Amino acid sequence: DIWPSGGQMTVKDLTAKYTEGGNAILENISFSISPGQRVGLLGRTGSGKSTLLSAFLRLLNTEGEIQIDGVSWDSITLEQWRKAFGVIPQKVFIFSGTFRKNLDPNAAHSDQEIWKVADEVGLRSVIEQFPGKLDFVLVDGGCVLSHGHKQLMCLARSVLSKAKILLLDEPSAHLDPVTYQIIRRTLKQAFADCTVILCEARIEAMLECDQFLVIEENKVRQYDSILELYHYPADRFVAGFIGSPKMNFLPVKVTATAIDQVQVELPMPNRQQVWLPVESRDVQVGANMSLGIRPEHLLPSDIADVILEGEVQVVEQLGNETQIHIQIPSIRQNLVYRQNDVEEGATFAIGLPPERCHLFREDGTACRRLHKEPG
C-alpha cells in the first residue's frame, strides 16, 4: 500500500499551541485540499502561517484531525507521517556519514536511483568533485556544502522518499537565486502531480495557484481562484494583496440599508448618495465604513453617473499601463486611477461605478459583493 497516493488533505478543527499550557495561535481550523493542488498561503503579519506548516509536521502541541489520503495522523509514527511531506526551506540535518547515507538513510535505493534524483535536482556535479563521490564522507555537519547544496539534499531526500505534499515556507526569501530556480524546476518536473502549499509575502511569485488559503482571526477562508481573490476579498487585507497599484479606500457613512444592498455617502463636502450591490447583513445605518475601489475599475468622466474631479499630482508612465494619481479637493484625499497602455497639474475627472465597489467595516471585514463578475 503505497502512501501517499494523490496528495489530498483534510483538516478538522485544528488547534496548534506551542506550549502545553501556553496560548493557542490557531483556535479551531477546518479545510480540505484536493490532490495535486497548488495552494497559496496568506495572512497578516503574525497570523500563524508558519505555525500551520509546523502543525502539519506535528512539531508542536496539536489538537484535532489531519488526514492525507484518508489516513489519520494518530495511527502513524511521526517520522512516517513526515515522510509524506517535502519541506523546503528546512532546518537541514546532515547526518554523520557519506553522501549516499545522507540521501538514502534507509539504504532502500540503488546507486543508479540515487544518481538519477541527484542529476534532476542538480547535485551530480556537487557530489562528483569529492574523491569518493557517493562514498565521500561529509564531516562537521556537511561544512563542504553551501546553504543551497544542503537544501538540494533535503529536496533530493524527498524526491527519493516520494513525498506528495510540499510545504514551501517562503522559498524565494530564504534561498539562493540559483538554488531557488532548481526548486521551481523540479516542482513542475518531479512533483508535477503533487499538492504544493506555497507561502509567500508577494502575490507576484504565487501567480500560479489553483487555490488560496487565507488565515482570518478565528477561521480560514479558502478562495477557489485568483479571480475569486481579486473580485471577492472577504477582508481588507486580501483586497490590498492582489492588484497593483493598491485598491483605493474611501471613508464612508451608511445612509441606508436594504435587503441585498447598502447605501453610503462620500466623506466630502459634496457627500453624494450611492447604492451598492453588496450584502446588507450586519450593517447598521449610520456606521462608519471603508469603500474599496480599484484603480483598474475607475471609469473616465464622460462615462459614469457618480463623477469626481481633481488636479493630477503624478502621471506615472510605465509603458504597458499609465498610473494617474489625482488629488481630489472634493474628497479630502487622493484617488489613484489606472488604464492599460496628459501631464501633471491639469484637471482630471473620474467616474466611480457602484457595481464594482467593495465595502469594508471598521474591523476590516467585507460585506459580500453580489455583482457577478464573469469568470
Ligand SMILES: O=P(O)(O)OP(=O)(O)OP(=O)(O)OC[C@H]1O[C@@H](n2cnc3c(NCCc4ccccc4)ncnc32)[C@H](O)[C@@H]1O
Ligand atoms: O512570519 P510572519 O511574521 O509573516 O507571520 P506568520 O507566519 O503568520 O506567523 P508565525 O511565524 O506562525 O507566528 C505566529 C505566532 O506564533 C507564536 N510563535 C511562533 N513561533 C513560536 C515559537 N517558536 C519556538 C521554536 C519552535 C518550536 C516548534 C516549531 C517551530 C519552532 N515559540 C513560541 N511561540 C511561537 C508567536 O506568538 C507568533 O506571533
